[PDB]
Amino acid sequence: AQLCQPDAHGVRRFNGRPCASTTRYVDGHKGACGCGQKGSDTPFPWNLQKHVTAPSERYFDDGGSNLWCGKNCGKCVRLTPTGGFVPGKGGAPPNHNPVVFMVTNACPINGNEEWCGISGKPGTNHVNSHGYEVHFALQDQVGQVEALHWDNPEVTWEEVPCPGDLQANYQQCECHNS
Ligand SMILES: OC[C@H]1O[C@@H](O[C@H]2[C@H](O)[C@@H](O)[C@H](O)O[C@@H]2CO)[C@H](O)[C@@H](O)[C@@H]1O
C-alpha cells in the first residue's frame, strides 16, 4: 500500500519528491506556535477549523527540540496524496487534490514514536518507523480532515508560500516574529 519507495538512504520518495506520512489529531490545545490569546491554553477558533498541522518535532523546529515557537511555525506545506497508505493504518483517499496546511503546532517525539519519532530534520535521511522523513498530524477538531476523506494518506510534501488568509491568521499568533 505504500507507493513511495525507499531511496538508497532509506527515505521514501515518489518520482523524486519526498513523501510524508499523515494522521489526524484533536486535542483542543492552543498549540506550540501560540495561535491563541497570550497566556491561556485557548486556540483561536480558526486554529481549530482550518487546514493546520502539527509536524513531527525535528521538522517543526528545523533540527532543534524547541516545542514553543519552533523555527517552522507559520510555514505552509502543500500535501498531495499519492494514493498510498501504511497497510492497516490508513486507506486510499477518494481523490488526490493537493491541500495546503499551515504549521501551528508540534508533534513531539515523546509519546508519538511510531509517526513522529524521527531523529533528524528533512535532508538528513532520518525516517520514522514507516520510512518517511517527516510526518504531518492534521488538525481535525471540526472534521475538516474527515471532510477530505483522508484516512492517514501517504503524500508528497513541499513548503509553499501560505495563502493570504492563513498568513493573516498567523500574524495574530504569539510566535509570529520570534
Ligand atoms: O497549548 C500551548 C502549549 O502547546 C505546547 O505544545 C504541545 C501542544 O499543546 C499539543 O497539542 C501537541 O500535541 O504537543 C505539543 C508539544 O508538547 C507547547 O509546547 C507549549 O509551550 C505551549 O504552552
Q: Give the technique used to solve this structure.
A: X-ray
Separation CA 145–CA 49 (nearest Å): 10
Protein residue closest via CA to atom 8 of ligand 1: 31
Separation CA 85–CA 155 (nearest Å): 9
Please give the CATH topology (third level) of the domain spanning 1-178. Answer: Barwin-like endoglucanases (2.40.40)
Helices (H), the chain: 46-49, 57-60, 113-116, 144-148, 164-170
Query: How far, in Å, is the centroid of ligand 1 from the Cα of 106?
Result: 7
Calculate the dihedral angle through the C-alpha atoms of 171, 176, 44, 96, rounding to the nearest 10 degrees: 80
Pocket test for ligand 1, best of 24, 25, 29 (most atoms within 8 A of CB): 29
Q: What is the CA radius of gyration of the chain?
A: 15
Instruction: Tell me the CA distances in angstroms from 177 to 73, 104, 152, 164, one per residue in order.
Output: 10, 14, 32, 17
Pocket test for ligand 1, best of 40, 48, 67, 110 (most atoms within 8 A of CB): 67
Cell 513531539 belongs to: 108
Domain ranges of the chain: 1-178
Ligand 1: atom nearest CA of 43 is 1
Q: Identify the CA nearest to 43 among candidates 174, 136, 176, 167.
A: 174
- Residues, the chain: 178
Q: Is 116 helix (H, G, I), strand (E, B) or coil?
A: helix
9 burial (CB, 10 Å; 0-12 / 13-18 / 19+) is exposed
Q: Identify the CA nearest to 44 among candidates 101, 104, 107.
A: 104
Query: How far, in Å, is the centroid of ligand 1 from the Cα of 62?
Result: 17
Q: Identify the CA nearest to 30 among candidates 54, 10, 65, 12.
A: 54
Q: Identify the CA nearest to 162 among candidates 97, 86, 77.
A: 77
Phi, psi of 133, rounded to the nearest 5 degrees: -75, -10
Residues whose CB falls within 8 Å of the CB of residue 34, separated by 6 or more in sequence, listed in order: 68, 69, 73, 173, 174, 175
